[PDB]
Amino acid sequence: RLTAYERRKFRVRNRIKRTGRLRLSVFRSLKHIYAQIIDDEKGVTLVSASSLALKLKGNKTEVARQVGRALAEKALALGIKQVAFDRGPYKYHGRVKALAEGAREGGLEF
Amino acid sequence: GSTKNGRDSQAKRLGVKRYEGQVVRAGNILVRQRGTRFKPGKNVGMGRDFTLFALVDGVVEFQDRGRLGRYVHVRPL
Amino acid sequence: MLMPRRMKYRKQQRGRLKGATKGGDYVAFGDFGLVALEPAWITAQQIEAARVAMVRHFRRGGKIFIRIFPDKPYTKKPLEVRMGKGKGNVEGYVAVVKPGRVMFEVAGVTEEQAMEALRIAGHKLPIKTKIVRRDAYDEAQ
Amino acid sequence: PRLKVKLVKSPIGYPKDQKAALKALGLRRLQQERVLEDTPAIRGNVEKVAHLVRVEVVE
Amino acid sequence: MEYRLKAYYREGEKPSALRRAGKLPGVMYNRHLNRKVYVDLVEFDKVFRQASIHHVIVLELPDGQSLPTLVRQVNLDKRRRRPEHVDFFVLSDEPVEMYVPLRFVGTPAGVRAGGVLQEIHRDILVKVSPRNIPEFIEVDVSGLEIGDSLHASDLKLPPGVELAVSPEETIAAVVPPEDVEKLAEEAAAEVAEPEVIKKGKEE
RNA sequence: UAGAGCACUGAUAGGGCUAGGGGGCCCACCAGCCUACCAAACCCUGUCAAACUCCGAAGGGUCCCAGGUGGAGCCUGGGAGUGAGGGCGCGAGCGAUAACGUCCGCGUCCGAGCGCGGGAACAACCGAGACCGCCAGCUAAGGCCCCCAAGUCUGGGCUAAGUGGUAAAGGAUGUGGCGCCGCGAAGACAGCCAGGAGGUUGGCUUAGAAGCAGCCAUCCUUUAAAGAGUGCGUAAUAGCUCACUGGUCGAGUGGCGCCGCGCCGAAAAUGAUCGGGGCUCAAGCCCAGCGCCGAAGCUGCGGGUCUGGGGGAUGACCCCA
RNA sequence: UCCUAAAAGGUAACGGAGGCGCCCAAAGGUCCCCUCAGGCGGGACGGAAAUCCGCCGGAGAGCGCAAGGGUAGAAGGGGGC
RNA sequence: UCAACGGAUAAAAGUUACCCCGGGGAUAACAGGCUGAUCUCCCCCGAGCGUCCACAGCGGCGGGGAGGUUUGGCACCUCGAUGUCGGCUCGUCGCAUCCUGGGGCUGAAGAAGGUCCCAAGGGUUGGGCUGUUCGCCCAUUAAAGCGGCACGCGAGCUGGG
RNA sequence: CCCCGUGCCCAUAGCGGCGUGGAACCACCCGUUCCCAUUCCGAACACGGAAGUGAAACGCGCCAGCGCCGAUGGUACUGGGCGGGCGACCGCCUGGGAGAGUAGGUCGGUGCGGGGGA
């Protein structure tokens, strides 16, 4: 038995996979936020960014914007440019939207 | 007496058209089917009648993925 | 007598009759059994005759198990009509019996009663039969 | 190792693929003997008609 | 009691050949071993008609060993009604599931009224240690009528044995007999013609 | 798909459990109690399915690489014929698990091989693809007592029915080979001997039912032994006999099961017949050998023709395939 | 559409069974969200079945309509433009 | 609803025993053939009848065959022709025997029957009705048999159907 | 070695039962001012937080009641080659070889990246 959480996750993620682009996978906990760029052709993660590894302040929104900036900066170093935003079960809004906006501000192409 | 039976439809000539390993070109129809008995894989598109056709030049390969179904891919050349 | 109470299709094709039995080749209820030796379509009339014969020999007492049931519909065209113009009309029902199936079993009766009853029952059948008793080979299946 | 195959029974009345098998081995007339290299393909075609033919192993 | 049987080893000999030589082929196995074997058909028949799968049969192997076994499976030739291959389970010291016979002690009152004691189970499945294999398990059926029934839950089990079926498994009953006086009412009782299941727009 | 299987769609017999009714007590004061009654769902045991499948072969199809030089394949064009098929084998459907029936699939053969050998004779069954010649040789199927070419060939067994040389259910001390049981010199079986008896002319039971007109009964006494009875018998009775024990004879006897070959069941129309004569430790039937005969197949020998390859250079003619 | 059809395709009969000659302006495009039938228990009128709550439930529901295939990791239910 | 759905024209139904030609045994009616559902006959089983008794005489429910005289199925020779019902004449054959002969069982006292077995040598009438075959009827009889031979026989006759 | 993400195998991974984990991570949790939200509901979604709890959910262990997996041997069936029956059908040779059932197995394995630990 699946839950609407997992169903929504599958539903957005398969449509992301079909486009054959690298996926900026987002995960959002109650405290922190994590984001890793994945190539599903090899089952490998290329670049990772998070507020737990960067030790960031309070406001989850500005924190996510900063982790997006960091992810885009570390990604442009490895030749990555175009990507597809894996919003997972999270509606593109608020914290996740700020992460995406920070990623675009760093030069990531999506 | 009489009969109310004798009628049928013209057969539809369905099924697989390019078995695994067969080199194909861009657009070759790979499978004809009602429903998704085979699902599209890498470099394989599907049409409005569930027809799998190659998206690039390459080589057919099948992949049975258990409960996920059966997939047909095109390895580039 | 014996016939299905409902079916998905009224008329069936004739099929084949090759091989030994698919199942029911071992005693599993009574003390004795009547086993078939050659394949045939055994009509419900014949099964009813055999049953009635066995209970008429027992007069009162014993238990009879019928392990075949006629679900194949027999068909026949009307008399003096030519070929074509459809398939015939269902005139009865038969049970596909193949070599080595126990068709009847008798329990709770003397050995002589069971032997003679199974004999008179077999005499109503359109095939050769064999009288069998329950063996440890049956008990192991 | 090579095979010595000899046609001993007539292909008349046998399915056409067995006639084609005879045509691959090079047997056309009865009592004709041929010596073919013992490869799996020639061996398969020889086994296909082994009821019409007599085989002996040589060299 | 305790039965013995002369066994032999077999490797590539075709089974049809052995059976035309009067020998019943089989296999000998447990969670530790597996060997193709064969026995004499007539001697095996003499033994098995008394032992069945209920009593232990020790196999006397040609290398000298004597392995205590249980008949686990026997295939029959459905057309000839004859044993064609035996399965021998080599016993160890741990417990094991098997079938123990049932003796129905007492003559039911239903049988005294004219009915029939239908023995639905002539044995029962039990998980027991090999050193504690009983010969049977008695059952009181003298208080049965037409038509009561006995179940596995009413089985008095000797020490060391445990039931290996659900206690809801019925084991015996007593049914009314066959009666000619019913032939008249059964012959003239009309049976309606079979109703075909509606396909398409009807249901 | 074959097979198999019951998890799905349906069928399905018995049992268990158990909504629902039927019926019976007990009530209209609304519930209760009993079901050898029909019976949903569910479980157990056991099954069935072209239009069911949790399963699932052998095969079949296609692509790749490789063998494969064949009256093979691929491209372009000229010219047709055919578009009534038929028998057989396998897989099915229709039919009646009928038709030298009918309609498909795979194959084959006749068609067009009504050319040849076998099958008595006979398009399609068996053998086998006929270029021409020979008073040569070897085989195929099939045959080797005479017609009629070649064994009255060798070794073992079965059959007595001319079975062989047309058929079924079913029936039988035909006969033979394997096994399985008992009972037997604690004297069996067969015959011949006596005994075969009491409660008891027993009961659910009725108008005769005394062992022997149906059932839901078979219990005891005297016993060496005797069923509250195998059959004949009676309107019932009576009688006779069996199972049964004792005696007499002294070594075998009776009841089952598997396999081989014969017997009956077996009546149709001009004259009979296995093709004929004729065959009985076969000239029949089974198992195993050796030899021979046997075709237009194969070989030897000569020749023609086409195709290819050498000659030679080119239709000059010869050799080889 | 299914069977016959002999596990590639195709395959006949006056063989076995059914349907079509429409419909939808959303029953179409896209983005976002949601998951059934059924069984048990509980609940005014309210019942076998109206709506409510809890637990079990991989799909037996649904997918305009015949049948088959397919299908909730949506092709089903709802909304926005 | 060119639905006869690859759709002869924009536009179309019947009758012929008054009939004709070109063809077909590629296709029916007669007969033969194959088949044997049907039909006729004979067996198997022994529920049950027969006061008593399964089998003198009978045989529920069912089972297996034989014959090729019925009606059919199929469409194989014959449509550049195999005359089709019934009769008359003339026969011949089969035997599942009507009579005559020889038997067994009998619910066979005798006389007379019933049933089955063997037997095809010979025999098996005259008339009323109706085209009839068949069948019914009259008067007899040892008996008034059933079938095959292109439903025997029109280069023998008849010609009522 | 533990935890958090994200794949692959596609139930040997599941149902059920018992036990364990909060330092970290995750979850529930405190709020509903702000963004966003309910065909009603801050349940869900969403935002700001950090008092508490591992009660739920999750992760990690153990158990074979169910579920799932499943040999070997034999058998059915069969491509090819032969016989037998008047037929329904039945055998032999050679190669292939099930399904059911038996023994038994299973309360998952593994890739990549992060946070913590030795």
Ligand SMILES: NC(=[NH2+])NCCC[C@H](N)C(=O)O
């Ligand atoms: N290997 C085979 N394909 N065998 C098939 C057996 C068929 C054969 N006709 C028989 O009855 O036995």
Ligand SMILES: [Mg+2]
């Ligand atoms: Mg109609």
Ligand SMILES: [Mg+2]
């Ligand atoms: Mg219609």
Ligand SMILES: [Mg+2]
């Ligand atoms: Mg049509």
Ligand SMILES: [Mg+2]
């Ligand atoms: Mg068609």
Ligand SMILES: [Mg+2]
């Ligand atoms: Mg078609």
Ligand SMILES: [Mg+2]
């Ligand atoms: Mg079709």
Ligand SMILES: [Mg+2]
């Ligand atoms: Mg295909």
Ligand SMILES: [Mg+2]
């Ligand atoms: Mg499309």
Ligand SMILES: [Mg+2]
């Ligand atoms: Mg579409």
Ligand SMILES: [Mg+2]
């Ligand atoms: Mg692969």
Ligand SMILES: [Mg+2]
């Ligand atoms: Mg690929």
Ligand SMILES: [Mg+2]
């Ligand atoms: Mg058919």
Ligand SMILES: [Mg+2]
């Ligand atoms: Mg029938």
Ligand SMILES: [Mg+2]
């Ligand atoms: Mg029929």
Ligand SMILES: [Mg+2]
């Ligand atoms: Mg019919």
